Write a protein that binds this ligand. Structure first.
Ligand SMILES: [Mg+2]
Ligand SMILES: [Mg+2]
Ligand SMILES: [Mg+2]
Ligand SMILES: [Mg+2]
Ligand SMILES: [Mg+2]
Ligand SMILES: [Mg+2]
Ligand SMILES: [Mg+2]
Ligand SMILES: [Mg+2]
Ligand SMILES: [Mg+2]
Ligand SMILES: [Mg+2]
Ligand SMILES: [Mg+2]
Ligand SMILES: [Mg+2]
Ligand SMILES: [Mg+2]
Ligand SMILES: [Mg+2]
Ligand SMILES: [Mg+2]
Ligand SMILES: [Mg+2]
Ligand SMILES: [Mg+2]
Ligand SMILES: [Mg+2]
Ligand SMILES: [Mg+2]
Ligand SMILES: [Mg+2]
Ligand SMILES: [Mg+2]
Ligand SMILES: [Mg+2]
Ligand SMILES: [Mg+2]
Ligand SMILES: [Mg+2]
Ligand SMILES: [Mg+2]
Ligand SMILES: [Mg+2]
Ligand SMILES: [Mg+2]
Ligand SMILES: [Mg+2]
Ligand SMILES: [Mg+2]
Ligand SMILES: [Mg+2]
Ligand SMILES: [Mg+2]
Ligand SMILES: [Mg+2]
Ligand SMILES: [Mg+2]
Ligand SMILES: [Mg+2]
Ligand SMILES: [Mg+2]
Ligand SMILES: [Mg+2]
Ligand SMILES: [Mg+2]
Ligand SMILES: [Mg+2]
Ligand SMILES: [Mg+2]
Ligand SMILES: [Mg+2]
Ligand SMILES: [Mg+2]
Ligand SMILES: [Mg+2]
Ligand SMILES: [Zn+2]
Ligand SMILES: [Zn+2]
Lengths: 53, 71, 96, 53, 168
RNA sequence: GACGGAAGGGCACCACCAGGAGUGGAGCCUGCGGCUUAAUUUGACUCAACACGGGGAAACUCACCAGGUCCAGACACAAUAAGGAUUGACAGAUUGAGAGCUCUUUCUUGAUUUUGUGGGUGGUGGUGCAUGGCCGUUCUUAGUUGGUGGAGUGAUUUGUCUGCUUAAUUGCGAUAACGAACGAGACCUUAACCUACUAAAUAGUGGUGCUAGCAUUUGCUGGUUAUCCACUUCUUAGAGGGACUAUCGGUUUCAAGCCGAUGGAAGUUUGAGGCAAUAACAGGUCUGUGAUGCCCUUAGACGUUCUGGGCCGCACGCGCGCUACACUGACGGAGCCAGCGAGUCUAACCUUGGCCGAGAGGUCUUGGUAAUCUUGUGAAACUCCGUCGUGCUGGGGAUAGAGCAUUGUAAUUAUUGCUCUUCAACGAGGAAUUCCUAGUAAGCGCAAGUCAUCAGCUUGCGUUGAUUACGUCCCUGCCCUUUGUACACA
């Protein structure tokens, strides 16, 4: 019962959100992980990304 | 910045006034009851709802928007 | 929250027989897993329950992992009018 | 490397190394039901595919 | 199904990273120390490695029965394809994850910052460790934040054995 | 302790010499200031602000501006209330609007609610001068503290050093200090080497069949996927091997070490990175966070949502970059050479091949969830053969007009691609200033990140590949002692 209140959100930055804190800035679309770049570093050791070089 | 020095713009909400809705009938003695404001042919609400006749148009309040019944 | 009696009775029936109700924090969805009602009708139903006890709430990565407590067993028993000696979820089937 | 925009522009890299093997074994189906329940290991995917047709 | 290995193995790491914080927040009062996952067909095994498993088990299997339901009802597993195993960790005082949770509960009860730090350094160095340090940052009877270094032992800070011999 | 236009020693091309390509000059892209604006959201200001916030903003993102909705104000208490406490709605009016938002109106819905108090919740609201975390920087230079014993009444000092040697508090040694803990080194990752090992139709070659063309005396160059076998030289990477300044000749009193030659894939710490102490900053971020104290706001909302506009406005100043000022070049054919990569499930990603079209592209199908297909990414600079002949020219493609298409609900302030036309400034850039020592500088393009579409950005990679130092402390600046001080906010 809501013709209003909706907008096309199939593309762009507002189409999706980070699965950590719903942030729209600095998000990673690569490899299907959808982690923002500030929270990716705190959980990089948990995923398996390490610093060799 | 946001002190809101705009004009009056008097707006309010709805009312939903509690008038005597079910005081509109035509009851006789011994023993029949003749119901005014005849119903609709809606197959979802079977013989329970009524219709409001305003001006050459009878509207169903149970259904939401568009069901045209005339008399 | 103002919601009809058909939507609320589908929540507490599913809450008692399962114990765990999850709901991702995402609105204008209205169709989600294993519950016919909207995503908004699930979250604000149990958020009304948190301030009187009866349930435990953890946030968990925008997904709202909920946990029924032992005090909410008596409240849903009176609400659904289910008889006693039937407590689903707590008793294990065979060993573990 | 920084969450804000202040500081020297230091970049940070990560890597995850994926190793993959495949072994062809002309085996009867009796030892197939044994080799799947044995040699289990976390983080290891075991795939059994249909023959050449 | 049908996920490439450059994305499925990444999503398995997201699966481990998502369960790291939830089993930290939920099992905070039970001495959480980290988990490991073992995927096998017809039965997926997730080992819950904590310090105190009776509180995780609860009264005759009520809390651990809910923890299996918290996983499979959102992650779209079938009922009966996931079993969470509780396991008591060995040599408590060697893992810094459970000792970091011990710092939080002492400060919420009203214990002093000097006694809560000294109680753990005396516990770790007598548990069989080579060295330990406790760094507390923030305000300590002040309007301005300070920092203290409660170090005791043999600690190196650079190189590859930092990635192997210390937990932070 | 800091600082000296104080001395001694040592080091650095974020320092200079010998040079290289530059920037600053011109147009343009972008960031900042200023001006303007309903708003031109707001942080950051020497190195350590300024192609920064991964910030390539059409909606969204966004916090700004002009307006309209929604409660998603938990719960507790009290009150009103089943004779309805409040929800929904057509048409018309109204509104940007097929928001009942409100109104004309009378059906609907049923205590889930409304009003008030109390209390929560939300906020890209304020405060980074309340903070956590993370990073930057002081230090990319070798520094950094305890145990015990000495010196001093003490603050403190010795150890932690005269000399010599290194990238180094490296060591040889010397000694009221002796033994240790950090950093450096070690370690780890990657690029180089192994005709040896275990192996490969998802990586290649040789041979045997079939078959096409050229010479025909045996050949040569190709094609063909379970025909048929062998091999692992390349390519992939499991376990390993391998330089250790080895050997030798000089040099310092021997010793740590340096220099030269030979051998060797490799003798600058093998090349390049990752990690990186103590103490400190009123460095940056409350606009990464459901990390957070306090304050403000909490419904005609500094919550949230929709429509439209802005972040792109502009006499002007600055910063990072791009294309050029050509004949070592433009232009037209032709030669044709890579690596790091990345790609679609309950969907619409990377695209081969065949047709249509000048192009942009469109259409019909197929391979690949990937060493398999795109892909040998047969990319550019380059190389050949021609035209051009010095004339703001055929160098330069800014500005401006018209049209054809793609992305998207939507492109006007032209998203972007393509075709025609417009064809300006710029004739080697003043004072100043940046980066760099070998497969580096520079030239060149590709991939990835942000991405529905768009880099002229950035992170990686490959191709072509110099000149000139192998030093010094002159300038800027950093370490170690000695000394001076009326500085300690140094
Ligand atoms: Mg919108
Ligand atoms: Mg107000
Ligand atoms: Mg060390
Ligand atoms: Mg090191
Ligand atoms: Mg020179
Ligand atoms: Mg632009
Ligand atoms: Mg600009
Ligand atoms: Mg501006
Ligand atoms: Mg403002
Ligand atoms: Mg601010
Ligand atoms: Mg400053
Ligand atoms: Mg500096
Ligand atoms: Mg840039
Ligand atoms: Mg703002
Ligand atoms: Mg009327
Ligand atoms: Mg600060
Ligand atoms: Mg800080
Ligand atoms: Mg002493
Ligand atoms: Mg000294
Ligand atoms: Mg000393
Ligand atoms: Mg090594
Ligand atoms: Mg080989
Ligand atoms: Mg340091
Ligand atoms: Mg900041
Ligand atoms: Mg931002
Ligand atoms: Mg933050
Ligand atoms: Mg009002
Ligand atoms: Mg008012
Ligand atoms: Mg009012
Ligand atoms: Mg509108
Ligand atoms: Mg706009
Ligand atoms: Mg010419
Ligand atoms: Mg040419
Ligand atoms: Mg060629
Ligand atoms: Mg396909
Ligand atoms: Mg390959
Ligand atoms: Mg080629
Ligand atoms: Mg050529
Ligand atoms: Mg300058
Ligand atoms: Mg490119
Ligand atoms: Mg791109
Ligand atoms: Mg030098
Ligand atoms: Zn996040
Ligand atoms: Zn009806």
């Amino acid at each position: 019962e809501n013709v209003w209140f909706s907008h096309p959100r199939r593309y762009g930055k507002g189409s999706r959100q980070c699965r950590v804190c719903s942030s729209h800035t600095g998000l990673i679309r690569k490899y299907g992980l959808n982690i923002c770049r500030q929270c990716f570093r705190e959980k990089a050791n948990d995923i398996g990304f390490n610093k060799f070089r | 910045k946001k002190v809101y020095t705009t004009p009056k713009k008097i707006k309010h909400k709805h009312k939903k006034v509690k008038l005597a809705v079910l005081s509109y009938y035509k009851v006789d003695a011994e023993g029949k009851v003749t119901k005014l404001r005849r119903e609709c042919s809606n197959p979802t609400c079977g013989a329970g709802v009524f219709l409001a006749n305003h001006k050459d148009r009878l509207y169903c309040g149970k259904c939401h928007s568009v069901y045209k019944v005339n008399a | 929250m103002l919601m009809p009696k058909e939507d609320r009775n589908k929540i507490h029936q599913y809450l008692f027989q399962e114990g765990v109700v999850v709901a991702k924090k995402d609105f204008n969805q209205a169709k989600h897993e294993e519950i016919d009602t909207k995503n908004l009708y699930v979250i604000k139903a149990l958020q009304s329950l948190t301030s009187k006890g009866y349930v435990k709430t953890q946030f968990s990565w925008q997904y709202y992992y909920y946990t029924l407590t032992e005090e909410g067993v008596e409240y849903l028993r009176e609400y659904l009018n289910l008889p006693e000696h039937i407590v689903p979820g707590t008793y294990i089937q065979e060993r573990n | 490397k920084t969450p804000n925009g202040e500081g020297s522009k230091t970049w940070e890299t990560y890597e995850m190394r994926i190793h993959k093997r495949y072994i062809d074994l002309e085996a009867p189906v009796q030892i197939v039901k044994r080799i799947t329940q044995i040699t289990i290991e976390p983080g290891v995917d075991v795939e059994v595919v249909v023959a050449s047709n | 199904a049908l996920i490439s290995k450059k994305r499925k193995l990444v999503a398995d790491g997201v699966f481990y990273a998502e369960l790291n914080e939830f089993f930290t927040r939920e099992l905070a009062e039970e001495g959480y120390s980290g988990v490991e996952v073992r995927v096998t067909p017809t039965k997926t095994e997730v080992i819950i490695r904590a310090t105190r498993t009776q509180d995780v088990l609860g009264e005759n299997g009520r809390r651990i029965n809910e923890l299996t339901l918290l996983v499979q009802k959102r992650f779209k597993y079938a009922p009966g394809t996931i079993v969470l195993y509780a396991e008591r960790v060995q040599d408590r005082g060697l893992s810094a994850v459970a000792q970091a949770e011990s710092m939080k509960f002492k400060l919420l009860n009203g214990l002093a910052i000097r006694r809560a730090a000294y109680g753990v350094v005396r516990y770790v160095m007598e548990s069989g460790a080579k060295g330990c340090e406790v760094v507390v940052s923030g305000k300590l009877r002040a309007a301005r934040a300070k920092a203290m270094k409660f170090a005791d032992g043999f600690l190196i800070h650079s190189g590859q054995p930092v990635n192997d011999f210390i937990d932070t």
